[PDB]
Assembly symmetry: C7
Homo-oligomer: 280 residues x 7
Amino acid sequence: MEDLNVVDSINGAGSWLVANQALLLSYAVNIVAALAIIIVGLIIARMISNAVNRLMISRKIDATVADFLSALVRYGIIAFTLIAALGRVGVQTASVIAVLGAAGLAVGLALQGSLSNLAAGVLLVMFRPFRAGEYVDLGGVAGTVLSVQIFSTTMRTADGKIIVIPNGKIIAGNIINFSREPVRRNEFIIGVAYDSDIDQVKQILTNIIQSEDRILKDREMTVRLNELGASSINFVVRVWSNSGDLQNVYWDVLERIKREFDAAGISFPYPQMDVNFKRV
Amino acid sequence: MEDLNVVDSINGAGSWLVANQALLLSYAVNIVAALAIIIVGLIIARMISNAVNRLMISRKIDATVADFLSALVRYGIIAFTLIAALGRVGVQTASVIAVLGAAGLAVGLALQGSLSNLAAGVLLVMFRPFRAGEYVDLGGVAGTVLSVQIFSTTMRTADGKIIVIPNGKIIAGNIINFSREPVRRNEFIIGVAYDSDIDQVKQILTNIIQSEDRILKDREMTVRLNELGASSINFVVRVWSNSGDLQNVYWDVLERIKREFDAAGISFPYPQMDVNFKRV
Amino acid sequence: MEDLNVVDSINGAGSWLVANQALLLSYAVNIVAALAIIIVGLIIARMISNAVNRLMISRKIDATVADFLSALVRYGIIAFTLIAALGRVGVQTASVIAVLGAAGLAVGLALQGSLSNLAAGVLLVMFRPFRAGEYVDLGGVAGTVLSVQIFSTTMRTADGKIIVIPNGKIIAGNIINFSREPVRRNEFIIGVAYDSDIDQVKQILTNIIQSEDRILKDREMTVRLNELGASSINFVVRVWSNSGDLQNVYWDVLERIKREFDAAGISFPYPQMDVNFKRV
Amino acid sequence: MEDLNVVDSINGAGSWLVANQALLLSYAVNIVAALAIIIVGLIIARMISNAVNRLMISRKIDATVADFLSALVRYGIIAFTLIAALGRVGVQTASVIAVLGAAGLAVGLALQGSLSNLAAGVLLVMFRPFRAGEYVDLGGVAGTVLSVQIFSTTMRTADGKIIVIPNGKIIAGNIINFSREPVRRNEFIIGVAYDSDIDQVKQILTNIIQSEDRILKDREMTVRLNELGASSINFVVRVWSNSGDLQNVYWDVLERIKREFDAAGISFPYPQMDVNFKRV
Amino acid sequence: MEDLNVVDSINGAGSWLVANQALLLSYAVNIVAALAIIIVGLIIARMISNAVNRLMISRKIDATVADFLSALVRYGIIAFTLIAALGRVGVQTASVIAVLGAAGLAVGLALQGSLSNLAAGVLLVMFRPFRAGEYVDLGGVAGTVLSVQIFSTTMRTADGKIIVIPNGKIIAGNIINFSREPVRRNEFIIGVAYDSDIDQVKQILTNIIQSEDRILKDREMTVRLNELGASSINFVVRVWSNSGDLQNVYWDVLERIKREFDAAGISFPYPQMDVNFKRV
Amino acid sequence: MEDLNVVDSINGAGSWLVANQALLLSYAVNIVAALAIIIVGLIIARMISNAVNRLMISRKIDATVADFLSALVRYGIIAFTLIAALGRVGVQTASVIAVLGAAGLAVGLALQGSLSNLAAGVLLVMFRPFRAGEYVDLGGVAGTVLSVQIFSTTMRTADGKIIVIPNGKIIAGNIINFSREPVRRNEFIIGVAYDSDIDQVKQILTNIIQSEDRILKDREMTVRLNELGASSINFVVRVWSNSGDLQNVYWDVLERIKREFDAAGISFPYPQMDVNFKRV
Amino acid sequence: MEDLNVVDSINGAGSWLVANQALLLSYAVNIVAALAIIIVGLIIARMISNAVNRLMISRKIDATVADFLSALVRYGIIAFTLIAALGRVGVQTASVIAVLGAAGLAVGLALQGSLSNLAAGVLLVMFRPFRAGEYVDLGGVAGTVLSVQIFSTTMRTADGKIIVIPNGKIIAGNIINFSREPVRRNEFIIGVAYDSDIDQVKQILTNIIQSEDRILKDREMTVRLNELGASSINFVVRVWSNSGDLQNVYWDVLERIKREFDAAGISFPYPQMDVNFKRV
């Protein structure tokens, strides 16, 4: 367009930039004021966030949630400072909040799971359905809980494993607790031959469970016929013992059951099979 | 830019701060008024929440929902106080509500599952499909319910387990109740040899179930041939008894069935097999 | 700041509170008017909700949906009541509606599933794919429906078990009705030895079902060779009978099949397999 | 506050209500006119909904979608009436529209599945991938379709079952149509001994399938060795027949195969095992 | 209220309707003009939708998307028509746009999957990963594709089945194409006795695959020992052939393998089993 | 209404249309201007989209993402053009943007999956975890990658199969790469009789793996007893070789292992069984 | 319409374009100013994003999150510039922000998961549940972690595999760490004959584990009878050793157990089976 796209417009057109010097000075002053407002807002936001966190901690509020609200307050104040600065810039204060809301929505979509994990961790720590050192199962993975972080928990399996579970999945599934009740129940299933004397087996098992000191005598001690298996008669034995002695009692009772069953002549049956013959 | 970025602008420029002292005093007064508004709003919010909770508790409303809505009222009032305080400050009253809405959306995304669990727990307590001490199954985990908390239920398995289930998953799945009906039905599957006399087996089982005092005689007592198994004829026996006697009746009936079947000469068959010889 | 933070500002500054007496009186009048508006709105909302529920119930509308929409009307009217009250207070009427909007969104985040269950209950009660008293299957659980509550369905398993299913899950999955069609079909699979005479077996099975009075002769009665099993020839028998006689007909036909097969010399084959011998 | 909360403000203060008699009359007139507007809006909404449904039914539009959108227009008109009435009362129409939007959002969250089922039912009826009377499978459940309702389909399994499937789930999964194609293919798997003559077996099967009049001779008829099984040589036989004769042809061909193989000396092999002996 | 609810207000109060006749005439004129505007908008929307559809179809655009966005334009234009008409009625257009938005949101929640099905159909038709007559697998169901409709795809299984699959699910899962490559590979697993000569078996299989004309000699033809099975040595044979000859080559090669293995004395082993005697 | 619905209103009422000729001309001019604006906006949108696509392609931006932003810019510009045109028509510019927003929301609900697939494809191209010609597994389906299109990826399975997978699914699941490392590990499980000499077996396996030139001697070569099986002692052999020689090394080592095990007298055991005899 | 659609309107109508020359010049000036604003905004956005990233990197902020926030600021500033330019051209500044919000919503739906992957990757690096070179399990896939990229992780399975896992799935599932604890536990299951001497077996196993120097003697070393198997007495042996020696200890202990069990005469039992003879 002849001279419209040349020095008549670029390089300030010689005198066009000079004639607009006052406008440039005003814009520079506005930008400087906006930057100063930004700096002041950041400083006051950090100060007020620290102050409110300290105040909340004093009022018996948990550290994690107090930090969460302190960070939320800090983010709100810095967003307010950005609103004020861009209003001083003159961007209608509406597109500014729209852009900030879009950015916050993107950040929320990014976090979602992490924030849910944080909330679940807060709930876990304040209800404490399980605590450090307590043996519990967490939805298919069982072990001793070491500690509960803000986003995840660390638990040690009996074999020395280290397992980290996000806190969000913890509250969604079941919380299988092994070490809450001081007393728990063992269950033995014993297979005997079909010709074995039921009364003798019951009496022997009753003697075995009677001779154990770690079995709670004041609770139920079930020794009864359970079901007629395909190749073996199955007896069910249920006894109660302290959670600490649960495993040892199981092994001791099983070893004894084996020993007296061998001595008494009661036979543990191999898989029975019945064969009929024809010639061809 | 020469002297624009030096003491001519920083350190109050000597007299610029002196001239702006009036505006600084006005802003300080505004900030003090806003802080006083925040304090009085927090105090009145706490008082109003306590008052409304106390009032509605008397109106036969459940404690959990009353506390929840009292907390909602308190949060609403503190948000309103923040709106008023920042309007006094001059943060356009629209960016403030937008940022508060974004924070509330983040908090809602955080809670989601937990707050749904709270709603579910409210539903369970007043409908009471199950209650403390009642033996129920909650989708693969069965035990005695101990208590129904606001977010979760603690239930004890028959073996001494302590099970914690979030309330939200409870209502989503089936509620399998064992102890609501005072009378329940047992089922026995008895395998006998193919050459066994059907009439004799049926008559013996009928005698066995006739002599049991804990079996309800006024209800159906089926002793019928069920299906021709691969290696055994299977009879089905169904009897009804009070829920407290179910297991004892099952065990006693099975043990008797074994005794009279042994005495009558009816044989429980091992896995049957027919073998044909070929020489190679 | 010298005396700015002392009695010159606190305790009403002596005369500052006195000079502000008119504004405090005006604010007290505003608060009293707002509270009176709240009370009037609550009472009128309750009256209007009761009136509309009573009116629409008479117009052949279901009780559950009528109660739901009456509660919705009551909540709406109290929402307008709070809007008007806080406008009287002077809370800009926009932050107010934003606050109740966030509260309603949180309430929805509570509901989802339970409100869906209520809607599903409405659909079930109005379409009645099943009705109380009949035997149905609702996605893996079978039993007799006892009643259909507004949130859940109570059904009794054939063994006396009490089963509670949320209404929402029922409509999402299949609804199998065992008792809708008055006539149903049994299916027998009979395994016979490979050397058995096919014509004799078919003729005997035809005789057995011909003499059953509870089998519908006007419908198809298939007795045909179904498949050549690994160890047995399998015959399929399909007969139709009234739903009330299905199990009894099944049991009687099976017992007869066994009796005449024993008499006719037709042998039910045990698991067949032949062995080739080598010495090593 | 002395006499602020006494007869001086309650019970119309003697003359305060009288001085406000004109304002009370104006409010009463406003309420009466608002109720009249509501009644007029309701009646005109009903008239317009009926008129539009009648008009669109004539224009070859399906009844279900026409009724749905007529109800939508009815709800829109009553919503407009509520807006007009509540705004003319002076509620600013903004809280009014927000409350109605929240109620509509709650209703939509409640429906969701039901409305999706209605849309799916419309799609199924207008595309008719299956039609009432034909035998089809809908994702694991097979039977004859009885009818397609607006919300769900009733379908009868071959054994007399009555199964109701929500329309939404139907369109999400596969629609397996057993009866669309008039001709279908049977498949036989025949196990014969390893020493059996392959040519003789193939020739016998070819004779068997050649003599069947219901087998389409113009289509492929494969009789070929399929795979060398663990204990048997497996032949695959594939023939085509009209969908009405599919089952009968299967049974007839299987029975003829058994009869000819018995006569021809070809042996169906029992499960094979090879045994090596050692003494210990 | 004395005479407030009598002929003094109902039945037009005699002269009140006479006085308001002018307003009634104005309202009637407004309603008539609004209805005329609705009619004009509807007809012009239909015309514009048809015109834009035709013009864009002329511009090499697919018919499905053309009809879709033409319907979108029609719905948009009728939406503007409703906005204009209801604004001329005096409904402020804000409640109008909110109600129409709520209706559109409900319609979208209804459609959702169906509209996704249309988009998936468009993607499949324009990318054509498969086409009519091409034998493919779409996630567990395999067959010859017949046609691809806008919402669902119809395909015929090899046995005469008719399969209808929504387009949305097809694109979400794997699309396994069976006939895109003109050449494909067969795999044979041959079990032989442990004492069989490996070199003889390998040489015989090599001759068998050498004597087949339909096996591509220019591609890999592996005949190697694959793994030492429990009872049999398993050889793997992999050959390549044209997709049209894949099945026939498999059957021919298997039948030959059987014939020359019988001729050469190489034995296909039955499940070998080892037995030790002890007397008891 | 007498003559209100007749020629006095229709057919322009004779002179009513004539008296409004200027207004009709103004409306026609407005419509013509709006259509011209639409045409100009479409042309300029296409031009600017082409220009920006070319510029981004020149600025080392990937072709797919450049095309995506070009299409986004074109759609945005045509949206602004429609806004301006309907503002010229006079449709309040707010209902217009609401209608376009609803249309865009519907289009987004339609695409959703496709747009996610496009983004996943862009990520897959730019990080290239796999590349054309490289053999990988992508969640249960393995084969050689042919190409990665914008919406989906194509793969050839080792048997010549054709698989097309959406890109969105690829990034969601694991990307299992077979051909990244130049060296990979084989694993042999060898079952031997319980009486076999462990030292002899280990020495023979070591001799076998030493003589293989394609086995990397600089890496670990594990030959150790792994576990005591039910019927066989299982040795584990792990060797490393270049990815190109993996299968050939496996086959050669297995065949040798068989040969020297036969030569040395070490026996591969058949399934062992212990039988105890009793007479009945 | 006569001459309305001809040169009187097109080609600038001769003088109509000339009369509007000033308006065209003003529009061209506005467009040039808008383009200059766009260029300046892009330049300043790039400069600010480069500066802020460098600024926060110095403040001990992670590189990934710093780059993410820098990109967010750049996109925000370019959006602000677009708002300013489209305000200058005169598009009401409202439809502009609506279109940009729709585009951002589409982009968010596109990335959605990928952005969540970036957030998960940021979470992983700071808490480092696993680190490069550390052998861990990622929910069904186990291997040595090579590196943690921003969207995915590369991990090498023990057999030379290359495994790529999206970061999002990592944080959602369990994280099992095999190499965090320096000491881990072994578990041996040893099956012995029923007649074997329990004390002898226990003493021999204890002697085996006492003689291993790599087994931690200060931790539990359980050698107890575990359960009575179908055909074998099963002993459980649990020992603890350093993670580096786990597999070697396992192999050595197993080989010894075999050797001294062979020497001591203790027999590993083959699958026992019980056979009863009958003649037919």
